[PDB]
Amino acid sequence: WXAXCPA
Amino acid sequence: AGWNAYIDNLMADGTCQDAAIVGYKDSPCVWAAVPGKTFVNITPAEVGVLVGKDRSSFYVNGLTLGGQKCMVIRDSLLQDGEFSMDLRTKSTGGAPTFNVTVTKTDKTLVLLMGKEGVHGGLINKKCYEMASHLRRSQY
Amino acid sequence: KTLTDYMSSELQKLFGIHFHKLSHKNPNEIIRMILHCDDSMNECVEFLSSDKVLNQPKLKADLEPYRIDWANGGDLVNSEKDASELSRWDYLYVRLIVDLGGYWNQRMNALKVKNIIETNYENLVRQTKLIGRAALELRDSKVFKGLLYLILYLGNYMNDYVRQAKGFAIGSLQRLPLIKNANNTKSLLHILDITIRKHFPQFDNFSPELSTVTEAAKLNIEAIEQECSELIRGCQNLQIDCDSGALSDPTVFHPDDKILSVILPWLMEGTKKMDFLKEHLRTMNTTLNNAMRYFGEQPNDPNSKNLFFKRVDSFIIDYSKARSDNLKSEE
Amino acid sequence: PPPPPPLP
Amino acid sequence: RRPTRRLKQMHWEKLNSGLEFTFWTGPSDEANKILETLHTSGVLDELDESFAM
Amino acid sequence: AALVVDNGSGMCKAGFAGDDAPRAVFPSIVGRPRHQGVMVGMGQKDSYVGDEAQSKRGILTLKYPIEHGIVTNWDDMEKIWHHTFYNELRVAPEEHPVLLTEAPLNPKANREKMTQIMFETFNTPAMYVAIQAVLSLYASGRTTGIVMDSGDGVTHTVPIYEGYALPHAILRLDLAGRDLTDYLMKILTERGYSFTTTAEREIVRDIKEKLCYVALDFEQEMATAASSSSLEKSYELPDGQVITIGNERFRCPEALFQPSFLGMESAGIHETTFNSIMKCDVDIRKDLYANTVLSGGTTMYPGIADRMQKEITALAPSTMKIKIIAPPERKYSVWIGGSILASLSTFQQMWISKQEYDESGPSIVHRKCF
Ligand SMILES: Nc1ncnc2c1ncn2[C@@H]1O[C@H](COP(=O)(O)OP(=O)(O)O)[C@@H](O)[C@H]1O
Ligand SMILES: [Mg+2]
């Protein structure tokens, strides 16, 4: 992700 | 002894200006009340509303007690433990309003309305006490 | 570890609620600032303006011997009647309600009217301008006239020969949605939307052209008129009070009472405000009235005077939904 | 009314 | 022009006040154009077929 | 000096009678570390509460002791109160009466439960419990009215009258701030931002407090939001990441007015306000409309007052006037009203004493302070 996790 | 003497006991402290006792069994009628006041004029129809099965109709426009308009605060007459009712008189043109309490016993209904500026809790605690005593006397 | 107030038990509760900001100050300090009519207690003065505080006959008798005859002599009525024995709030009530009760109701009236005028004259002029502009716009709109003529000409076509009237009221426009065709899919107003669009490009969209009518439908004419009319009554009642009423006499006034020193500067300016608002009040009435006959209705019916823009606005939204449904279904 | 009981 | 068949009848409220004060009395040339266009637009023909009971 | 302690689902407020602002305002959270400690000699505590827990929230498992009004853990609830007196206020409770607040339509189970833990663990000399809703309009300076009480746990609509609550007319709606924060995260993932854990639940709480607002017209605003980028705002994550939201500013707060967005059959507070006042008497109904008040941190959204005023006006008859009272200090209105109530001279009458409790027992609270 963008804000959070890696994705 | 002397049903009127309870009214004297009810008026010992002077925190109330009207007090009465009414037997709600069979034909309702006042057993003792303050002469010339509100509580002396209770009709059986008003008693039937107070002890009636319908516990929601008096929320739409209140009820009348001796012909004087009053609003419902909380209803706990038919619930075990308190058997008590709370009312506040309804007035027009900024006229003074007073707190009204009713306690239900085995045979009687005890009614107290205090003077101006008197908190309802004081009126409630007394009526519960004499109602508690009166039920201990099997009335 | 457990650890002579004539005032009623209930009332001590109310006094402490409103004057909480002044707990650290003595009665002598708070008795002084209130007479200044300062901005910091424009809210607390309303609490002492209530009927609850004033309508206390039993205390007024109790604190009467403690009153100071400030009207003449400025001396205590009785001999000693020390005020230190009284409690904190007891000192205030006798020195403010009982002592100044002769002009207390008059002074609060000068201050209650002071607050209401200071904030409503700005908006009241805005409301009366919108209604007058909306009435003039409706009267001076060819588009609104043109659609009514088209409706009348179409309406006379399907009507009988014995009922071929040349005019109708605005309130009759609600019958269009109530008429349906054979399959009930399309109502009478729905034909009008496609009829106007196909052949009358000038009448395609009149809602953006006339917008002030819609906002004018959210205001009550009688309520606004009564609200403004209340201001003039209070103003003229104030004039007879400051000039020839209880406020006129300054002998009963305390030296540290600038209530006379604050109302009089506004007295000249306040007269200007009521004159302008009176002109605007007359302007709205005639501006509504000339456009009122212009469409056949009368203000004598109170509902017609109030529900005049509502009926026009009701047709505006009704035409809007009719057009939206017509466009959605065909596209 | 029936006879009343003693007061508290 | 009158329809050949009876159609749906709409009912209005007659103006109690005199029509002279109303804008209906004023014979503006714009109103005359509405009648001329309506009689030639063919909308009246569609009314007969659709609005017949 | 009488203590006025305001236990709340989200924030806990405490101070002194007569003060104009709470002395200590700290979150009502309890934290227990989920990882073993390797650095010895620090004297690390077992449980962390309040600001200190919020400071180190990353390595803590925050728990709310109160959920949906009902206290789900009585062991933690004293700890935050224990931290409240000795740590935040630094005052011994043995010589000061304390004031706590109660919730509308509260079950009878709790009411002695706070009573039985204060006169015993902290042995406060005196006590009194009142409705937080009643104290709301007390700070507003009025005694009769209806309160639009909304907070972190629950929402209640109480049409007070001379300071005496109407139990039958009390309506309870389950649309609170925690629901919106939970609704904000499920809609924030549309933009590629995934916040799931409890520590970052405070982060979105911070975001909506600063960026979210109430839009006057939903249909007009989504059209404008899609068309233009003006409504978009940039927020800074504590790690330094930059985020931007386009239409979520007015969408999350809108669920307070459209609960079907969350899927709740019960409708918004605008009708619930109207629904509650339908239950009252007709003659008194005139007063209730013009003295409506807003309270709680949930009602902090910009443009919330005019939006509710517009909607209930359509619901209300055209004859009636509606006056939405929204004091800017209504965040601490419940606390301030209690300090006002405690400071009253007549307030000493309905004290419950330590001695009187001993002969009367826990049951005295139901009849003494009601
Ligand atoms: N400026 C703001 N904008 C939006 N929400 C806010 C704002 N300030 C506080 N809040 C919300 O209000 C809540 C505070 O609840 P609170 O009123 O303390 O509950 P209680 O009434 O039970 O004490 C917080 O959870 C927070 O999310
Ligand atoms: Mg709350």
Side-chain angles (χ1 to χ4, degrees), chain F residues 8-9 11 13 151-152 205 208-209 296-298 300 331:
Chain F
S9 309
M11 295 298 103
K13 278 73 67 178
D152 193 6
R205 192 176 53 84
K208 59 95 184 176
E209 282 173 353
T298 305
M300 295 298 102
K331 187 172 182 52

Side-chain angles (χ1 to χ4, degrees), chain C residues 136-159:
Chain C
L136 199 61
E137 275 291 351
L138 209 53
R139 174 203 175 100
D140 291 358
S141 181
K142 162 65 57 178
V143 190
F144 185 72
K145 303 175 190 189
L147 59 90
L148 293 176
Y149 272 120
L150 161 73
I151 282 182
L152 174 71
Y153 287 147
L154 289 172
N156 291 319
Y157 182 60
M158 301 66 88
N159 285 302

Side-chain angles (χ1 to χ4, degrees), chain B residues 59-110:
Chain B
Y59 290 121
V60 301
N61 58 5
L63 59 89
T64 61
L65 188 153
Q68 298 70 38
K69 289 186 60 182
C70 50
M71 61 79 71
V72 170
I73 297 169
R74 164 220 50 62
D75 168 36
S76 286
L77 294 174
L78 310 188
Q79 315 291 330
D80 180 54
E82 63 280 17
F83 296 95
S84 66
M85 187 66 204
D86 189 358
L87 283 72
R88 174 89 180 199
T89 69
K90 293 189 292 183
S91 77
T92 301
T97 61
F98 319 102
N99 288 76
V100 169
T101 191
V102 181
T103 46
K104 178 173 195 288
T105 70
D106 191 64
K107 303 177 206 229
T108 68
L109 294 174
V110 188

